[PDB]
Design a protein around this ligand. Structure first.
Ligand code: THP
Ligand code: CA
Length: 129
């Protein structure tokens, strides 16, 4: 896998963000995770976490996996990095997302994210509290 540039257009919620990629606006859905909806418990906190992380970054990058690059709703499916830290991983380390939606062929960072979830669950953080 490889990182490609993008710039933020707008934070949406815990696991969706609007980015400019190859010069075109796209909504990205973070691979391999699930944040609560804004209306559910920990939703606001996930949205805020992601928002802060993407808005404060000097450098946003997109990393597609090996499979499908857009989902059935036209959202890009990627690992998104903010100054080299994976937002997908950071949410999970924080107990603000679960590992979820693990489809064969776009699952490169599964075990990385599961390891983070195990540690969050042991700290009993947020979702795991
Ligand atoms: C994360 C991800 C979600 N999706 C689809 C599955 C779910 O379909 P359904 O809408 O039919 O439940 C939906 C979940 O995304 P959200 O959690 O953003 O709703 O997006 C993919 O198809 N591929 C993916 O990698
Ligand atoms: Ca969600």
């Amino acid at each position: 896998l490889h990182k490609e540039p993008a710039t933020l257009i707008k934070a949406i919620d815990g696991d969706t963000v609007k980015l400019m990629y190859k010069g075109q606006p796209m909504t990205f859905r973070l691979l391999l995770v699930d944040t609560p909806e804004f209306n559910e418990k920990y939703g606001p906190e996930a949205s805020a976490f992601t928002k802060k992380m993407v808005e404060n970054a000097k450098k946003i990058e997109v990393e597609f996996d090996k499979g499908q690059r857009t989902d059935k709703y036209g959202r890009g499916l990627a690992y998104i990095y903010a100054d080299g830290k994976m937002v997908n991983e950071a949410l999970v380390e924080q107990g603000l997302a679960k590992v979820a939606y693990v489809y064969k062929g776009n699952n490169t960072h599964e075990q990385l994210l599961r390891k983070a979830e195990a540690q969050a669950k042991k700290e009993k953080l947020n979702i795991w509290s």
